[PDB]
Amino acid sequence: PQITLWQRPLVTIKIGGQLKEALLDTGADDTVLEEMSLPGRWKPKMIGGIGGFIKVRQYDQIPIEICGHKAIGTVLVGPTPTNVIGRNLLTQIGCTLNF
Amino acid sequence: PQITLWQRPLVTIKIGGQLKEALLDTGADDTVLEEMSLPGRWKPKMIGGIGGFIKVRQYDQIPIEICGHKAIGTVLVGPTPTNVIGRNLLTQIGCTLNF
Ligand SMILES: C=CCNC(=O)[C@@H](NC(=O)[C@@](O)(CCCN(Cc1ccc(-c2ccncc2)cc1)NC(=O)[C@@H](NC(=O)OC)C(C)(C)C)Cc1ccc(CC=C)cc1)C(C)C
Numbered sequence A, B: 001p002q003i004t005l006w007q008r009p010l011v012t013i014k015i016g017g018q019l020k021e022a023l024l025d026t027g028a029d030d031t032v033l034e035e036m037s038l039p040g041r042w043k044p045k046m047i048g049g050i051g052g053f054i055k056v057r058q059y060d061q062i063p064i065e066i067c068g069h070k071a072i073g074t075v076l077v078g079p080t081p082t083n084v085i086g087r088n089l090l091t092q093i094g095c096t097l098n099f
């Protein structure tokens, strides 16, 4: 579709069979989600936002639907003010910026 | 143009006489720039991202130029770790997400 930016670009995603709201964020390298359960082992990452650094859990090869578009990729879980979908999955679902 | 999301979407802006690089961020409510001088009135503001909040100065009705597109809008100045263009100005130059 085509999403204008007069509001927050909030969409519905599906991960682990549950629906969630998340924010499509082109200023983000990475995709980071609020606390939740995911299968398998995880690795550490430090990621930096506008406000400083947080520690998150990295899970790889995780299926996720963004707006009904299927992707499988890396998901971080951590203390974030919102769910955000960063470039790493935006490119999987064929996103570009246009003006 | 059409801008890809394989890489960070960085662009040049002219503002306040200076050239600057900055990051087209669809997730950002506001536009925030590193420390710099702007004319006229301002008020203090706390803004929130990953890792918490920072204090900025808010100037309104500032002329900016982005990729040759003139807009006018609110610009926050402060100790952000990188320059970001937010939805408040992205709208004015007709920028949308597409997939
Ligand atoms: C007051 C209104 C609500 N807050 C906001 O709208 C703020 N927006 C952001 O922080 C956001 O759009 C992220 C900005 C882009 N940022 C840009 C950015 C990039 C690098 C940093 C570098 C950065 C930090 N430290 C050292 C080097 C800092 C910010 N990227 C990241 O922070 C990402 N980090 C990276 O991509 O790092 C590569 C990531 C999400 C994964 C932490 C994500 C975001 C979006 C909305 C909200 C509020 C919603 C409840 C919070 C966070 C500011 C920027 C306006």
Ligand SMILES: [Cl-]
Pocket: A072, A073, A074, A088, A089
């Ligand atoms: Cl990925």
Ligand SMILES: [Cl-]
Pocket: B072, B073, B074, B088
């Ligand atoms: Cl504005």
Ligand SMILES: [Cl-]
Pocket: A004, B094
């Ligand atoms: Cl429009």
